[PDB]
Write a protein that holds these residues in place. Structure first.
Motif, PDB file in Angstrom:
ATOM      1  N   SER A  14       0.828  -1.195   0.000  1.00 34.05           N
ATOM      2  CA  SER A  14       0.000   0.000   0.000  1.00 34.05           C
ATOM      3  C   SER A  14       0.870   1.256   0.000  1.00 34.05           C
ATOM      4  O   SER A  14       2.051   1.231   0.354  1.00 34.05           O
ATOM      5  CB  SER A  14      -0.929   0.005   1.211  1.00 34.05           C
TER       6      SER A  14
ATOM      7  N   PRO B   2      -8.504   9.041  -2.103  1.00 40.72           N
ATOM      8  CA  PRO B   2      -8.453   7.775  -1.364  1.00 40.72           C
ATOM      9  C   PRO B   2      -9.174   6.668  -2.117  1.00 40.72           C
ATOM     10  O   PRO B   2     -10.232   6.884  -2.708  1.00 40.72           O
ATOM     11  CB  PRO B   2      -9.161   8.112  -0.049  1.00 40.72           C
ATOM     12  N   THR B   3      -8.591   5.472  -2.090  1.00 41.15           N
ATOM     13  CA  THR B   3      -9.183   4.346  -2.796  1.00 41.15           C
ATOM     14  C   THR B   3      -8.760   3.052  -2.118  1.00 41.15           C
ATOM     15  O   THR B   3      -7.663   2.955  -1.561  1.00 41.15           O
ATOM     16  CB  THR B   3      -8.771   4.328  -4.275  1.00 41.15           C
ATOM     17  N   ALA B   4      -9.647   2.062  -2.162  1.00 43.78           N
ATOM     18  CA  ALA B   4      -9.355   0.709  -1.708  1.00 43.78           C
ATOM     19  C   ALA B   4      -9.399  -0.213  -2.917  1.00 43.78           C
ATOM     20  O   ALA B   4     -10.411  -0.263  -3.623  1.00 43.78           O
ATOM     21  CB  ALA B   4     -10.351   0.257  -0.641  1.00 43.78           C
TER      22      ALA B   4
ATOM     23  N   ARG C  96      -5.166  -3.637  -1.239  1.00 41.09           N
ATOM     24  CA  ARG C  96      -4.327  -2.456  -1.083  1.00 41.09           C
ATOM     25  C   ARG C  96      -5.201  -1.248  -0.783  1.00 41.09           C
ATOM     26  O   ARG C  96      -6.406  -1.264  -1.035  1.00 41.09           O
ATOM     27  CB  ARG C  96      -3.487  -2.197  -2.338  1.00 41.09           C
ATOM     28  N   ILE C  97      -4.582  -0.203  -0.242  1.00 40.54           N
ATOM     29  CA  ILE C  97      -5.238   1.080  -0.011  1.00 40.54           C
ATOM     30  C   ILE C  97      -4.287   2.186  -0.440  1.00 40.54           C
ATOM     31  O   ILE C  97      -3.125   2.203  -0.023  1.00 40.54           O
ATOM     32  CB  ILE C  97      -5.645   1.264   1.463  1.00 40.54           C
TER      33      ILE C  97
ATOM     34  N   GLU D 101     -12.121   3.580   4.524  1.00 40.19           N
ATOM     35  CA  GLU D 101     -11.472   2.821   3.465  1.00 40.19           C
ATOM     36  C   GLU D 101     -11.030   1.438   3.915  1.00 40.19           C
ATOM     37  O   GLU D 101     -11.028   0.513   3.098  1.00 40.19           O
ATOM     38  CB  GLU D 101     -10.276   3.597   2.916  1.00 40.19           C
ATOM     39  N   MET D 102     -10.652   1.270   5.178  1.00 40.83           N
ATOM     40  CA  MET D 102     -10.373  -0.061   5.697  1.00 40.83           C
ATOM     41  C   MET D 102     -11.637  -0.890   5.869  1.00 40.83           C
ATOM     42  O   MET D 102     -11.547  -2.118   5.957  1.00 40.83           O
ATOM     43  CB  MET D 102      -9.625   0.032   7.030  1.00 40.83           C
TER      44      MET D 102
ATOM     45  N   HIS E 125     -13.894  -0.989   3.453  1.00 41.07           N
ATOM     46  CA  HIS E 125     -14.004  -1.626   2.152  1.00 41.07           C
ATOM     47  C   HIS E 125     -13.143  -2.871   2.022  1.00 41.07           C
ATOM     48  O   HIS E 125     -13.569  -3.828   1.371  1.00 41.07           O
ATOM     49  CB  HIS E 125     -13.616  -0.652   1.029  1.00 41.07           C
ATOM     50  N   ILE E 126     -11.948  -2.880   2.614  1.00 40.47           N
ATOM     51  CA  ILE E 126     -11.087  -4.054   2.564  1.00 40.47           C
ATOM     52  C   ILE E 126     -11.657  -5.230   3.347  1.00 40.47           C
ATOM     53  O   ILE E 126     -11.611  -6.367   2.858  1.00 40.47           O
ATOM     54  CB  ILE E 126      -9.677  -3.718   3.079  1.00 40.47           C
TER      55      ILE E 126
END
Ligand SMILES: *[C@@H]1O[C@H](CO)[C@@H](O[C@@H]2O[C@H](CO)[C@@H](O)[C@H](O)[C@H]2NC(C)=O)[C@H](O)[C@H]1NC(C)=O
Ligand SMILES: *[C@@H]1O[C@H](CO)[C@@H](O)[C@H](O)[C@H]1NC(C)=O
Lengths: 596, 193
Positions: free
Chosen positions: A312, A327-329, A338-339, A356-357, A359-360
């Motif tokens: 990441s 910001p993107t996941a 990844r982030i 965003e975490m 989404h992971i």
């Protein structure tokens, strides 16, 4: 046969798709983090190969009957490969669409405005006007940046959007759809059982029923905010009028979270914005992402993989290469998560580490489903998972366990009002904007608005739904809605509306599961492993089941319910009522900055 | 001093493919299993039929070492009485297995930037394998009742597919070297230990 030839056809489609769709994401990642003239070519080539494979495999699959001879999951997988995506367009139309999209993206990314005094001093959107519109308090400073942004890139974006709309309406017509808006609204269709059914045309009536009980609560907040802004700007404010566009806390007005210092209820009490504590205690971008992982482990969710800490970005690389800081996941496939985020030491970038975490964790959950069923149950389900985490992470007592607030901090009614007003500045303040913008795009795509009346209808719906006036009138050449990142990058924007309802439904369900007695806005599901399995059972389903059944599994409902949202802001509705005892609630559309 | 060849099946530069596994017949040697622990980290060491303690009073007529390379999600398929793609079309173990398996992660050797396409597996065999059968044949697989003649399409498929190993996948989709030892006690009198 059929049913026995479908299993062998999908088993051959899957292992080709998982391999040919991984190297198209590894090229986009290498382009977004490096930015050159070779990575862009590689990304284009990989995308072309993946599109050609899918268009070949989607017409082949349209020969499998499907009357009723199959099993449920095979039927669901086959009803998703029979869409052809955007491959219905011919080579010329597809090339035109790709060229227009690339041009708009490059123009938006490289858009810059230069200081009038020094022509060699020019500022971009991200490290430039964003800080001015987020931290400045001068009328002239805020108006200038807004006008320059709407006059440089927005005016250039007008010609492309016409052909963009025409082509994407044609491709929707080719795919058995009336218009491209109905194509975007087709994500809310469910067919899995009796009673667990929905139709893609029911969305508009529900999205309107829900935006009836909410506006009374928003009007009092608007009244309070304008009362504070009148003291802030005695001159360019009218009590019987609408708020100016540039005086909203952002470039567009999406979130009013930056109006908290101006409209703080009680200054004496300790602040809820813990940016200064984070700066002083010595917090870096790694600690922000390590305190947001201890939260997911306590509630009973897996750790982050070891290929997440080494791959990441998590911080602007400095050096000399250009990166995109949105910001993107990323779920690249084959177990690669990844982030990408240019983290800074602020509270705003702290809660964003939980969104965003979130989404992971959702991506890590349905990774056991077949390839075609690895998606969120709904386009609004995927954005409502990070938000319920950010709701708990922002409570005034969760900040004491991690040390961001003094050990002798005292919590009372003033603290409750501070916290609730800060939360409502972000959640309530974005609903009218989201609903209006999506409504405008839906009306444009359905061809109910002439090409010569776009901006006039736009600024006319603003001051009847949202309540924001424009400082200077715009002609027909101006293209204001194209300023937004989502508008110019072909992204749906209704996810952020149903997100804000699914958010509170899920939060109340999880609070009840955690055996918590008290108010809703003080839940803190942390350290509760019995509210981390109730969610996970829903996250690990994907598209394998209708979204109505997935919602019923958790909240016991088959549709949107706005009652849970109203309980969250109940202590704030009253105080706003008494504080607005002698104020004129409502805005005047007939008012204008110029006479007559 | 007569050591036994446990470094020519454990320390090879390249292993075989799953569908074309290597079988080596160890005989006439002194079996020192302690050196097997030279690697130390083992993803799996579950042992069936015998005890890991290796009672010294155990003599075997022949030993067979079968070596191949699979994913990390497919290691659990190497066991008596399982099902999947590896234990139905590639490598089958008998229900009365005597002996055991050793698997360990091999991402630093079998992974390459751009992909490693030297490792293949079989899909679509049309019939399950029998214990200890290899089947390295390559012919077009038909799923319907329309003949296939050298053309791969619609209902005609190629039975062999590659792994394409890359670094930065994750434990599940990452290379794992597996060697399985089987012990045989033949009817002839034992003289080899
Ligand atoms: C960012 O991209 C540039 C341009 O592609 C990379 O620089 C070149 O990379 C190629 C292979 O990708 C090498 O063959 C060249 O020797 C590199 N040029 C120089 C001057 O080093 C650069 O390595 C990329 N940055 C990364 C991958 O971190
Ligand atoms: C494999 O061979 C290398 C090369 O000498 C050696 O260092 C290593 O110890 C060997 N591992 C064994 C025998 O398990």
């Amino acid at each position: 046969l059929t049913e026995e030839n479908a299993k062998t056809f999908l088993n051959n489609f899957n292992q080709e798709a998982e391999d040919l769709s991984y190297q198209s994401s590894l090229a986009s990642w290498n382009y977004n983090t490096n930015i050159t003239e070779e990575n862009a070519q590689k990304m284009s080539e990989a995308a072309a190969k993946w599109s050609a494979f899918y268009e070949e495999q989607s017409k082949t699959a349209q020969s499998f009957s499907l009357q009723e001879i199959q099993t449920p999951i095979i039927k669901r997988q086959l009803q998703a490969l029979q869409q052809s995506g955007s491959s219905a367009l011919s080579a010329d139309k597809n090339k035109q669409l790709n060229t227009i999209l690339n041009t708009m993206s490059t123009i938006y990314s490289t858009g810059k405005v230069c200081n009038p005094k020094n022509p060699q001093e020019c500022l971009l959107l991200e490290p430039g006007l964003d800080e001015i519109m987020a931290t400045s308090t001068d009328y002239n400073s805020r108006l200038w940046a807004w006008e320059g942004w709407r006059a440089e890139v927005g005016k250039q974006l007008r010609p492309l959007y016409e052909e963009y709309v025409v082509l994407k309406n044609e491709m929707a017509r080719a795919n058995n759809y009336n218009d491209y808006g109905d194509y975007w609204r087709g994500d809310y269709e469910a067919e899995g059982a009796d009673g667990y059914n929905y139709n893609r045309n029911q969305l508009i009536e529900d999205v309107e029923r829900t935006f009836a009980e909410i506006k009374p609560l928003y009007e009092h907040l608007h009244a309070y905010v304008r009362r504070k802004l009148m003291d802030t700007y005695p001159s360019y404010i009218s009590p019987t009028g609408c708020l100016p566009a540039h005086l909203l806390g952002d470039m567009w007005g999406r979130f009013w979270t930056n109006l908290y210092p101006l409209t703080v209820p009680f200054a004496q009490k300790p602040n809820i914005d813990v940016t200064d504590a984070m700066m002083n205690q010595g917090w870096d971008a790694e600690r922000i992402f390590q305190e947001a992982e201890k939260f997911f482990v306590s509630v009973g969710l897996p750790h982050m993989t070891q290929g997440f800490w080494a791959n990441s970005m998590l911080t602007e690389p400095a050096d000399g290469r250009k990166v995109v800081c949105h910001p993107t996941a990323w779920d690249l496939g084959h177990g690669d998560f990844r982030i990408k985020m240019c983290t800074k030491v602020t509270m705003d970038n702290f809660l964003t580490a939980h969104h965003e975490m979130g989404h992971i964790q959702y991506d890590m959950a349905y990774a056991r489903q077949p390839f075609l069923l690895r998606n969120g149950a709904n386009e609004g389900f995927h954005e409502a998972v990070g938000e319920i985490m950010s709701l708990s992470a922002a409570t005034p007592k969760h900040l004491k366990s991690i040390g961001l607030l003094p050990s002798d901090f005292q919590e009372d009614s003033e603290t409750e009002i501070n916290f609730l007003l800060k939360q409502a500045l972000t959640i309530v303040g974005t609903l009218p904007f989201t609903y209006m913008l999506e409504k405008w795009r839906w009306m444009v795509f359905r061809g109910e608005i002439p090409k010569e009346q776009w901006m006039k209808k736009w600024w006319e719906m603003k001051r009847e739904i949202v309540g924001v006036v424009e400082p200077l009138p715009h002609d027909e050449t101006y293209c204001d809605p194209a300023s937004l990142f989502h508008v110019s990058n072909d992204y749906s924007f209704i996810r952020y509306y149903t997100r804000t309802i699914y958010q509170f439904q899920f939060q109340e369900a999880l609070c009840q599961a955690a055996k918590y007695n008290g108010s809703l806005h003080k839940c803190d599901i942390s350290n509760s492993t019995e509210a981390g399995q109730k969610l996970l059972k829903m996250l690990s389903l994907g598209n394998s089941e209708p979204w109505t059944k997935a919602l019923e599994n958790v909240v016991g409902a088959r549709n949107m319910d706005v009652k849970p949202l109203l309980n969250y802001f109940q202590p704030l509705f009253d105080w706003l009522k008494e504080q607005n005892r002698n104020s004129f609630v409502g805005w005047n559309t007939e008012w204008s900055p110029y006479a007559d | 001093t007569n050591l036994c060849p446990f470094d020519e099946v454990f320390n090879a530069t390249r292993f075989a493919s799953v569908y074309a596994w290597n079988r080596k017949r160890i005989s006439n040697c002194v079996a020192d299993y302690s050196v097997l622990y030279n690697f130390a980290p083992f993803f799996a060491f579950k042992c069936y039929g015998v005890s890991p303690t290796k009672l010294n009073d155990l003599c075997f007529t022949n030993v067979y070492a079968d070596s191949f390379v699979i994913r990390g999600n497919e290691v659990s398929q190497i066991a008596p009485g399982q099902t999947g793609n590896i234990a139905d079309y590639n490598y089958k173990l008998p229900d009365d297995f005597t002996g055991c398996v050793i698997a360990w992660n091999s991402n630093k050797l079998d992974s390459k930037v751009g992909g490693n396409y030297n490792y293949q597996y079989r899909l679509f065999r049309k019939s399950n394998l029998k214990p200890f059968e290899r089947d390295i044949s390559t012919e077009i697989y038909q799923a319907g009742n329309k003949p296939c003649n050298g053309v791969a399409g619609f209902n005609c498929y190629f039975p062999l597919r590659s792994y394409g190993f890359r670094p930065t996948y994750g434990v599940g989709h990452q290379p794992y070297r597996v060697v399985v030892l089987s012990f045989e006690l033949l009817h002839a009198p034992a003289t080899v230990c």
